[PDB]
């Protein structure tokens, strides 16, 4: 079949070079071009460039300056190439098969999340949410975990290990200056709460950071 | 550039439904070497996008006659005649015809459900956070639908923006809501200058906010 393998960092350092191989099988470069493309949750699906199967190069404008595609047609791969990146360079990076005329020969390469910063690993700070002294209780109680300033992506966060299933949202990281947040939610019912124990289990394997978190009423 | 202008922006459907999704070039797409290249992907959650239409209408190898893309010149069409549960997830136009090649901004296929208030909570900042001197009041917005929301906080009756991070969930595959978490992050000493925190949730449900609030020195 088809397939599109691609390799390369996850993390890139601001001012420095992202380069990905795209390794291609199933079809050869002899015959096809190969375009790279980005998505980011801002621009959405952003084309940068593409090299013809005769070896030939575009690039779209803004990244001239800064871009090279180029290939070894025997080994079937693809380099992409990009100079000075930064923060507004976090994307997911792919190369594909694009503009196509045939029923078949046609793929994606699986992606490369590619984020841009200096930030160090660091493991997060890890606070519970307990409901404030003058709330009033209702018949499900909610609670949560606030998981702050860690780097890199990602964590995962548990309730009494895996007991705790139904009821539970843990939302996507969020960039605070150079470092990650997140939070958990969990509903449980009142009667339930605290005279049954609910602790959130944080891991960030980055930093080989296990925590556990009792959420215990203020 | 050509632009491509994908609508709507998101489309709510049943299963069964039939749907149709529009595509808007700012420049007729021509031909290059007799073939008009405008080709319709469908991305799902965590998946690289998938090939659907090809050539405007050609239908890729094992995508089922559900589908079907039409048009020419600057408009043009994808359409499912009967929408099935896999077919959810955001689809993109794409045209090859002019370099820069350009995309849509994406048409995201959802799924309807009964309308649903948010459950709002607040949390005022643990005692551990403001030892390190630092203060986060968290609010949270669950299962809600439709997705479209908006989360006003409030200090002492004055709203406040600076310090402010929001967070949405994809749609549950189950219960088909949505659901959203905003943080208000500021200095122990900023946090203690204010007693009154609100967290505003305007959302279609209601046409008054839901509201929930906590005063510092209560706490
Ligand atoms: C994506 O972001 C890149 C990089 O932008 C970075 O973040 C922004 C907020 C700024 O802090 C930049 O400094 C960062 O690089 C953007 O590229 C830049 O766009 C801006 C225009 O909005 C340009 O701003 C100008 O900078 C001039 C300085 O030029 C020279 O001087 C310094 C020497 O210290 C050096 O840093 C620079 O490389 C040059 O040697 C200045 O004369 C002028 O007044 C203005 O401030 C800036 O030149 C670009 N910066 C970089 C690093 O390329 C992209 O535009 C942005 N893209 C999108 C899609 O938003």
């Known amino acids: 079949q088809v397939q599109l393998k691609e390799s390369g960092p996850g993390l890139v350092q601001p001012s420095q070079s992202l380069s990905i191989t795209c390794t291609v099988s199933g079809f050869s470069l002899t015959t096809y071009g190969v375009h790279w493309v980005r998505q980011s949750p801002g621009k959405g699906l952003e084309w940068l460039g593409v090299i013809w199967s005769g070896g030939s190069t575009d690039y779209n404008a803004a990244f001239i300056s800064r871009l090279s595609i180029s290939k070894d047609n025997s080994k079937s791969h693809v380099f992409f190439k990009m100079n000075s990146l930064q923060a507004n360079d976090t994307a997911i990076y792919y190369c594909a098969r694009m503009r196509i005329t045939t029923d078949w020969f046609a793929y994606w390469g699986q992606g490369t999340l590619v984020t841009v910063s200096a930030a160090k690993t660091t493991p997060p700070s890890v606070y519970p949410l307990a409901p404030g002294s003058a709330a009033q209780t209702n018949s499900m109680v909610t609670l949560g975990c606030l998981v702050k300033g860690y780097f890199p992506e990602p964590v995962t966060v548990t309730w009494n290990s895996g007991s705790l299933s139904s009821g539970v949202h843990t939302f996507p990281a969020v960039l605070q200056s150079d470092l990650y947040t997140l939070s958990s939610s969990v509903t449980v019912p009142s009667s339930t709460w605290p005279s049954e124990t609910v602790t959130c289990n944080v891991a960030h394997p980055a930093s080989s950071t296990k925590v556990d978190k009792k959420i215990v009423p203020r | 550039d050509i632009l491509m202008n994908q609508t709507p922006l998101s489309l709510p459907v049943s299963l069964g439904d039939q749907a149709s999704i529009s595509c808007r070039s700012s420049?007729?797409?021509?031909?290059?070497?007799?073939?008009?290249?405008l080709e319709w992907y469908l991305q799902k959650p965590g998946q690289s996008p998938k090939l659907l239409i090809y050539?405007?209408?050609n239908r890729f190898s094992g995508v089922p006659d559900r589908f079907s893309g039409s048009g020419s010149g600057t408009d043009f069409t994808l359409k499912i005649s009967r929408v099935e549960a896999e077919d959810l997830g955001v689809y993109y136009c794409?045209?090859?015809?002019?370099?820069?090649?350009?995309f849509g901004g994406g048409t995201k296929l959802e799924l309807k459900r009964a309308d649903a208030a948010p459950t709002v909570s607040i949390f005022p900042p643990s005692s551990e956070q403001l030892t390190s001197g630092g203060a986060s009041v968290v609010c949270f917005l669950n299962n809600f639908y439709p997705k479209d929301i908006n989360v006003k906080w409030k200090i002492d009756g004055s709203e406040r923006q600076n310090g402010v991070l929001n967070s949405w969930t994809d749609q549950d595959s189950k219960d088909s809501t949505y659901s959203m978490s905003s943080t208000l992050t500021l200095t122990k000493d900023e946090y203690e200058r204010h007693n009154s925190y609100t967290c505003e949730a305007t959302h279609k449900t209601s046409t008054s906010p839901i509201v929930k609030s906590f005063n510092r020195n209560e706490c």
């Open positions: 420049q007729y797409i021509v031909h290059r070497n007799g073939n008009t290249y």
């Open positions: 794409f045209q090859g015809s002019h370099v820069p090649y350009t």
């Open positions: 050539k405007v209408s």
